[PDB]
Amino acid sequence: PIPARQLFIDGEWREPIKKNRIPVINPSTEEIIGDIPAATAEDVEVAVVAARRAFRRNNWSATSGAHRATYLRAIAAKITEKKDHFVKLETIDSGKPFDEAVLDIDDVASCFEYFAGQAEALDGKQKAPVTLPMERFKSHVLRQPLGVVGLISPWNYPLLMATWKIAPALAAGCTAVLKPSELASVTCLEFGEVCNEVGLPPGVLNILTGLGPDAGAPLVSHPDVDKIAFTGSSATGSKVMASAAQLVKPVTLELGGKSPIVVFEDVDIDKVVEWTIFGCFWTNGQIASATSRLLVHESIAAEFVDKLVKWTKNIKISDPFEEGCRLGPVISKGQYDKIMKFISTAKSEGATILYGGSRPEHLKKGYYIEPTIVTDISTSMQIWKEEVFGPVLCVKTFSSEDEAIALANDTEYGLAAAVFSNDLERCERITKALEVGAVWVNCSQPCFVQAPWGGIKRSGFGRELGEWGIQNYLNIKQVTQDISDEPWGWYKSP
């Protein structure tokens, strides 16, 4: 059985005011395994009032970064301590292979530990001097918490994506309301328990589960929420930013993508094929930065794709708890239907389904989709243009570096890309030319909390993580003082 919880507001478990709840479904069995609170606008009001109250106390926001760091480290210890509990819940809820979930939960701890360090570095950045040319004045910078922030996250790494926002927010001195995805809210609710166990002050983090328009939208439109951190689809990001615009409320947008993986002839085919499959099929294909468009040099394309299908066919598809699982079911019935629709229109538009594109025969139940390889691609095809968010990879060949770069940048998106070539000068040339927020060289998808992360173009804007993460939650306050004790001397005294 799974946990059963209420909303987490002001250090305590509270029932949604309208008392609606929605199903939790296991994507591996299609069965109802529990349910979660379904917050509405009334719950948002209560949660942000608590967040505002917590922000105004003398125990969090104006405290030192080192002080908040003890909490972040304690959270990291708690998570690591309760590792089995979270991994199992994440696996049951999200359908991702057990081995993937342990890395997620490992990364959650890593991220809180990383931002404890960032909270500490903050102290030394306080009253950072600004050198002015006039001896009459002095200037420095204060870095203060912005205030109450709304954090809205997706389901593909349920607790990790929440953590990418929570850790920086707390590190900065903000208080927060989290609204995780309705497709995978179990571990994020469990996180409320962790907060209470580390004695995180009441109202510092509030957790509201529910649907986007019912719990999320009121969070974005609330007069007393100073900032929104949003991760989701480009279409939703547009709505969120449009709403924020009414109150001129700042947002960050981590949105969708259709990232290319470019592969030249001078590579180790077997090493690149594994990265290619990690690039497009890992996390069951539900990666924002998934390298879902393979561009491979025509001189090695036939051999490459042959070994691609051979590795792909060796991927163990099973219940995510089965020993050796390397591909689980996609997250939901809705997603399953969308992905299957993408596959059919691909076939209808003239694409070749070279492998997969179907349900695994041995698995009667669960939203299981075979890793799918799609060839004979035209660039006008939907499957080439739009984010599928399923284990579906498109293949095109190129003749020259010139054509590789043209094809790689031929997308409205711009989150990431990967480039493979033993000529590292070539790699750098491609790297600079890619219209993208992140470039992997001779790999695809490694994600470190140390490095800034974000897209351009229709993949959104702003950078989370690394030294950039905490500054999304800061008021950069200028303070400049007249130290002369002299009259200004612009006007005439009477």
Add this chain to the structure above:
Amino acid sequence: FPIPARQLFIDGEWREPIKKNRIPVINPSTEEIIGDIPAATAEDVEVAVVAARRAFRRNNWSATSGAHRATYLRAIAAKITEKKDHFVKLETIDSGKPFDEAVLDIDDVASCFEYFAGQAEALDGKQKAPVTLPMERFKSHVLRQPLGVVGLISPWNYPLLMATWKIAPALAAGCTAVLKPSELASVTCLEFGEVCNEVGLPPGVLNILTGLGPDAGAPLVSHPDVDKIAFTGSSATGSKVMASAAQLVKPVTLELGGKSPIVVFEDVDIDKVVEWTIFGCFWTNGQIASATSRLLVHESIAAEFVDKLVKWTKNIKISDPFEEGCRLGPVISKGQYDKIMKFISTAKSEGATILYGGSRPEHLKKGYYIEPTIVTDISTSMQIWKEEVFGPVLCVKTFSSEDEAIALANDTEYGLAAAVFSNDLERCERITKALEVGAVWVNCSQPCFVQAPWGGIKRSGFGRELGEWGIQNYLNIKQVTQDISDEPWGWYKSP
């Protein structure tokens, strides 16, 4: 001296607007038409953005080094300094600010390009900055690349300086740009085009479209090939701009309005502080975003201070901005003029006291002149206390408690700036931290240095311009992460 007549500045040449419209230039001092400017339309926005995109796709600009771009930025500063007298004169007649104020603006324009030249060179040093990773298998660094084509939209209260705050870092970053300055004061910005050709700025790197906000500004915001908008203007326009940009999930920065508090405690030299409060609210003819327009003064010295405040104010020379000793000129236009007069009138109507001014000066019977206005007996529910007036109009209220002053000062939807006066420096810093604002002046009001970050919170917008923050607004922070192992990943089972 003559007022130039100039076409749009596009792709390094002077181009008539496609629909061939022009709009008047009015001298605020005389209410008379002194000239005219191009009135760009959406059609012109399209050709400008195309030119900027083409200029970006070369590697003589976007892909070159910061040091390369810096030679142009310094060339530009030197050219502005060389033509200083010309720009000062045009800025004065066009904007309506005192000549002495315009002199400073143009000094600051040149200083700003110099500062960002330095920031362009520092950018080079920053390229490929190592990022330490825990796994010896992977190495990471950051590339700081120009975002692309940017839309830069600026207000009339410091015409060339406000434009420059955007141009200098955009170009330093390596972006190409379309500037649309205010239709109320476009002369000097258009003139900036001639400077660009004189330093050999590559065609299309900066394009200048003058015209109406809706007609020229909005199509720039909603254009599909503009990657980011840098906006300075009213909170109301800021909302429009961000709502428009949101349709394309287009990043924006917003430098909006304010209703900034000036907090004066009892331990001060009253004549020193009085000059700073008039400077804080009446300088630039009251047309300052960060204007300290809400005077919060200790009840202890309230009486004396307001008395001296009034005396200094009576002594402010109001005149045509070219007149020797001018310390207050006309507000920018008829519409602002009327707006401000209406603010004052409804303030009377709600029972506020017009202690001084509030009226058009006797000896000036044409021009948008308004006496510096001191309004007292305030309630916090009055329009004049809540809303940005943008004229030489100061509200006054007393306080007894420190916690009262803080509460009154933060009792605003805005959050741009603030000023606190106290000989007690421990008290200043305490106040500084508590104010819900992006900038705090201590024992002064309004001095603006390019070296320090600038912007607000709350309804005053978000984002920081200038200082070491200015350049970043125009960058793609690119993570580059590479596998140096040449070993199998070993996640999947090899076939």
